[PDB]
Amino acid sequence: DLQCLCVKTTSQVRPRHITSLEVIKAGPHCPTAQLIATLKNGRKICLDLQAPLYKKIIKKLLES
Amino acid sequence: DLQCLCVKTTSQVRPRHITSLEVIKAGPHCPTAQLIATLKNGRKICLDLQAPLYKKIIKKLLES
Amino acid sequence: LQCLCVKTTSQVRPRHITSLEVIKAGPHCPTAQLIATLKNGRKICLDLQAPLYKKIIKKLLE
Amino acid sequence: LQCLCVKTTSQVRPRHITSLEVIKAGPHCPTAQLIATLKNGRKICLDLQAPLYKKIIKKLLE
Ligand SMILES: CO[C@H]1O[C@H](COS(=O)(=O)O)[C@@H](O[C@@H]2O[C@@H](C(=O)O)[C@@H](O[C@H]3O[C@H](COS(=O)(=O)O)[C@@H](O[C@@H]4O[C@H](C(=O)O)[C@@H](O[C@H]5O[C@H](COS(=O)(=O)O)[C@@H](O)[C@H](O)[C@H]5NS(=O)(=O)O)[C@H](O)[C@H]4O)[C@H](OS(=O)(=O)O)[C@H]3NS(=O)(=O)O)[C@H](O)[C@H]2OS(=O)(=O)O)[C@H](O)[C@H]1NS(=O)(=O)O
Ligand SMILES: CO[C@H]1O[C@H](COS(=O)(=O)O)[C@@H](O[C@@H]2O[C@@H](C(=O)O)[C@@H](O[C@H]3O[C@H](COS(=O)(=O)O)[C@@H](O[C@@H]4O[C@H](C(=O)O)[C@@H](O[C@H]5O[C@H](COS(=O)(=O)O)[C@@H](O)[C@H](O)[C@H]5NS(=O)(=O)O)[C@H](O)[C@H]4O)[C@H](OS(=O)(=O)O)[C@H]3NS(=O)(=O)O)[C@H](O)[C@H]2OS(=O)(=O)O)[C@H](O)[C@H]1NS(=O)(=O)O
């Protein structure tokens, strides 16, 4: 009934452009964790789990 | 980067078992609208768009 | 009263809404909650009043 | 002050959390928002305090 939201991660986007980050735990409908980021223009993208980039994105959004 | 969350709809579930319903507009990452329902036990399922069932689920959750 | 929607809002541009989640009342929230997510990822609590969320759900279903 | 997280909470079972969304501050919300979604679909606003959301994000990443 449900699959993963993200097909492939991305590496390049400006942390300034990010308004929202959702962290989704692995579940019955997706074997891997997911990192969905929403941008000012409505564009949604996926981040890499094995990178410190998500750590940078998160640390910024909270600092705002 | 993103696909649809729901693969196939469902027809049978008890409206009593439903705690949350999310209505997702069609977008660049999914050609069709989506109706995701969350249940007390954590189970998530998709509803049918061409049915009055979603109308029943929604009308109940608000009445609660 | 430990709800997501303490104060609630009536003014929003329906075209800016990408999703609407209806969360049911419970021991922790006296009322149902209408959470709308906008294009920019932000969220706001919709007034449970009638014609507001009526038109929205249909515009999400087009 | 028309935020999702007016009042905020500190007591939640991390195993009950299925997702955590960080919404950034803006002209409409003075602070960033930590919205946690539980197994039963409900949502609660997490305290922006340190060790609460630190352990959670990692438990979501296992
Ligand atoms: C191209 O060069 C540019 O370089 C950088 C990068 O640009 S980027 O950010 O676009 O990538 C620019 O730096 C940014 O400059 C500002 C900007 O983004 O415009 C500024 O952003 C902050 O302030 C924005 C202006 O808002 S306002 O307060 O001055 O009015 C704000 O964007 C506005 O958000 C409001 C809002 O959310 O309330 C919007 O208001 C409108 O919608 C509201 C909500 O609608 S709803 O549907 O019901 O929900 C309505 O209630 C309201 O009536 C309505 N107002 S109206 O005017 O339409 O009538 C409005 O449309 C938006 O423009 C930013 O909000 S945010 O959501 O994007 O975060 C806000 N960001 S903040 O800094 O975090 O507070 C910053 O200086 C900077 O943005 S950034 O976030 O730091 O990246 C640079 O300005 C620009 N150079 S330029 O070429 O000279 O322009
Ligand atoms: C098998 O036969 C059954 O038939 C029907 C159908 O069952 S079904 O609903 O499971 O499908 C049963 O009818 C239901 O009966 C009640 C029930 O579901 O148990 C009742 O539901 C309402 O009340 C529940 C009991 O709560 S309590 O207030 O009395 O304490 C409630 O479930 C509890 O929710 C709380 C909660 O959300 O706060 C939970 O508390 C615990 O977690 C909290 C939050 O954690 S968090 O992670 O931090 O977020 C903690 O804060 C708290 O400390 C902790 N308490 S503790 O006990 O663990 O220490 C608790 O775990 C839950 O059990 C229902 O909440 S809900 O979220 O499911 O909606 C609530 N539903 S409500 O009616 O909408 O308010 C109803 O009568 C009915 O449920 S229903 O929603 O109408 O469908 C029937 O009882 C049963 N017959 S039986 O065989 O005899 O049992």
Numbering used by the authors:
A (entry chain B), B (entry chain B): 107 to 170
C (entry chain A), D (entry chain A): 8 to 69
Task: Copy the relevant paper text.
NMR studies reveal that PF4 exists as an equilibrium among monomers, dimers and tetramers. Each monomer contains three-stranded antiparallel β-sheets on which an aperiodic N-terminal domain and an amphipathic C-terminal α-helix are folded.
To investigate how the GAGs might induce or augment neoantigen formation, we crystallized PF4 in complex with fondaparinux, a homogenous synthetic pentasaccharide heparin that forms complexes with PF4 as assessed by atomic force microscopy and photon correlation spectroscopy. We solved the crystal structure of PF4 in complex with fondaparinux as a model GAG. The PF4/fondaparinux complex is a pseudo-222 tetramer formed by a pseudo two-fold non-crystallographic symmetry and a perpendicular two-fold crystallographic symmetry. This asymmetry in the PF4 tetramer explains why calculation of its electrostatic potential identifies only two positively charged grooves on the ‘closed' side of PF4 tetramer surface to which fondaparinux can bind. Fondaparinux binds among monomers A, B and C or monomers A, C and D. This interaction stabilizes the AB/CD association and the AC/BD association, thus further stabilizing the PF4 tetramer. One fondaparinux molecule not only binds within the groove on the surface of one PF4 tetramer, it is also shared with a second symmetry-related tetramer through binding to its C-terminal helix.
